[PDB]
Amino acid sequence: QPEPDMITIFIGTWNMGNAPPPKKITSWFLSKGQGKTRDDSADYIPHDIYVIGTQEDPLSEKEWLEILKHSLQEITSVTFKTVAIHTLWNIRIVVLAKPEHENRISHICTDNVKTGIANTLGNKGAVGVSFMFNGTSLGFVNSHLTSGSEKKLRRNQNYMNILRFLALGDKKLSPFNITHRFTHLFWFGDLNYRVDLPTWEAETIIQKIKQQQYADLLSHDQLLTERREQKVFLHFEEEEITFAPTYRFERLTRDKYAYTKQKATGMKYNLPSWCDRVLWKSYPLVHVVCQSYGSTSDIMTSDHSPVFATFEAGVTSQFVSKNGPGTVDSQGQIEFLRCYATLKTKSQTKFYLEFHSSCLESFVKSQEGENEEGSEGELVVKFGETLPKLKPIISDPEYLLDQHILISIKSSDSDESYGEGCIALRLEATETQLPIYTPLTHHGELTGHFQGEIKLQTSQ
Ligand SMILES: Cc1cc(N(C)[C@H]2C[C@@H](O)C2)nc(C)n1
Numbered sequence: 001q002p003e004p005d006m007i008t009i010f011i012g013t014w015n016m017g018n019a020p021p022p023k024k025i026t027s028w029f030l031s032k033g034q035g036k037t038r039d040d041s042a043d044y045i046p047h048d049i050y051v052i053g054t055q056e057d058p059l060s061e062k063e064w065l066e067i068l069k070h071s072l073q074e075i076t077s078v079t080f081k082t083v084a085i086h087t088l089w090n091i092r093i094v095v096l097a098k099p100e101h102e103n104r105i106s107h108i109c110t111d112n113v114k115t116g117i118a119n120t121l122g123n124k125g126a127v128g129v130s131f132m133f134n135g136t137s138l139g140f141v142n143s144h145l146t147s148g149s150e151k152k153l154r155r156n157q158n159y160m161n162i163l164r165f166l167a168l169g170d171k172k173l174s175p176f177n178i179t180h181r182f183t184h185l186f187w188f189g190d191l192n193y194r195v196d197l198p199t200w201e202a203e204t205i206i207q208k209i210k211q212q213q214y215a216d217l218l219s220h221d222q223l224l225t226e227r228r229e230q231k232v233f234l235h236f237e238e239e240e241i242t243f244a245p246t247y248r249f250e251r252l253t254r255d256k257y258a259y260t261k262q263k264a265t266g267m268k269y270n271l272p273s274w275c276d277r278v279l280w281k282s283y284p285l286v287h288v289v290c291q292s293y294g295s296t297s298d299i300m301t302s303d304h305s306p307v308f309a310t311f312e313a314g315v316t317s318q319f320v321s322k323n324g325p326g327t328v329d330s331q332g333q334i335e336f337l338r339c340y341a342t343l344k345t346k347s348q349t350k351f352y353l354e355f356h357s358s359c360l361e362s363f364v365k366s367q368e369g370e371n372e373e374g375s376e377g378e379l380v381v382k383f384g385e386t387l388p389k390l391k392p393i394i395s396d397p398e399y400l401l402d403q404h405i406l407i408s409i410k411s412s413d414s415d416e417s418y419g420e421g422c423i424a425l426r427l428e429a430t431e432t433q434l435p436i437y438t439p440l441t442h443h444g445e446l447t448g449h450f451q452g453e454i455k456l457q458t459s460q
């Protein structure tokens with residue numbers, strides 16, 4: 001039985017509005033409704049992994065697991081295995097996988113982050129799951145961010161607290177947050193970003209939605225505009241939105257948006273908005289293709305509609321050679337020429353690099369770089385030809401070209417990372433000097449860049 005080089009992943013997000021679901025929710029898992037929908041000819045084909053995020057979920061874990069597993073069994077005739085389930089208040093994540101994957105999945109991790117302080121600590125935050133699927137690390141985050149049209153900055157703050165403090169994936173990757181720990185990271189939820197148009201334009205917005213004319217609405221979507229200004233979700237992707245706003249509906253129909261201010265809303269308007277979203281970030285030059293992104297039309301218990309997204313995701317096998325794991329493979333090496341970091345810091349300490357990768361027996365510290373001043377004020381840290389030669393555990397190009405090197409630039413004075421990035425070994429050539437580049441981030445904000453050349457030797 002061959003190991004897969006691709007899997008498909010279902011991501012669902014649904015703010016259930018504290019109400020039990022209706023008796024049939026299969027349209028969600030089938031990616032049917034509005035937007036980019038799944039072909040009918042695939043309806044009996046199970047996805048490999050289903051990841052379900054709920055918010056305002058009134059059900060017990062047991063109650064929701066029974067509904068999810070029975071739904072999938074009805075669709076696919078497969079009894080899925082529960083990989084993980086984690087709940088913070090009424091925010092929940094469930095991971096289900098086909099039984100054939102049970103012995104491909106390991107290192108399962110769950111965590112949560114509570115956002116806000118005093119007043120604002122008590123119902124918002126995130127839950128997440130990570131695991132290995134054969135040689136590939138997968139992370140999943142379900143967040144319920146701060147509500148309200150005039151709180152986009154709070155949402156952005158909630159995002160940074162979540163990516164700083166959610167403790168998923170390999171703890172040995174200590175300089176790295178969740179935005180660097182996984183081959184594929186999916187972040188979804190009721191992100192709560194709104195269409196920022198004047199309240200007086202509510203009926204105009206509704207008209208546009210009825211005409212399926214979303215362009216003048218999406219140009220005011222706060223998540224797209226905050227992302228375009230690099231205020232949130234730097235380096236994450238989102239499929240184009242081609243479905244109507246998923247909030248705020250009258251319950252038991254989808255014929256009406258309920259936008260007007262009410263005591264129950266704190267006297268706030270809820271103009272129709274794309275609150276419910278799926279984004280991803282995958283390492284450079286790994287296969288990831290969104291094959292559906294939409295909302296259901298026939299699940300009406302909540303004031304939100306469920307959102308679905310599906311992905312093809314490249315995966316790798318758990319590689320064993322005669323040499324590594326358990327030793328190095330002398331026919332392999334990774335070399336670095338003409339390398340330098342450009343940092344935005346106003347500080348003057350020495351810096352060194354750390355290289356982390358599951359192709360190395362353990363992480364590698366460089367010598368300190370040489371600081372110079374950039375012609376536009378920057379700190380440039382020069383490594384020239386001084387970086388260590390990295391010794392991979394396996395030299396076989398079918399393994400090594402699929403790997404990635406995480407880079408942290410660290411202060412000599414404090415050993416704190418000032419920037420983190422990732423370099424793919426999926427090169428155009430081996431034994432050839434080739435340009436490399438990554439942006440550097442810290443707490444998910446841009447802090448600099450790392451560029452230079454690489455020379456990769458494999459056994460071929
Ligand atoms: C908790 C945890 C650990 C982990 N490790 C150690 C990987 C096994 C592979 O050899 C590196 N990976 C993930 C995704 N999570």
Ligand SMILES: Cc1cc(N(C)[C@H]2C[C@@H](O)C2)nc(C)n1
Pocket residue numbers: 223224225227228229234235236237
């Ligand atoms: C090259 C590139 C561009 C980009 N853009 C323009 C986002 C659309 C959102 O409005 C800003 N996002 C990413 C992740 N990469």
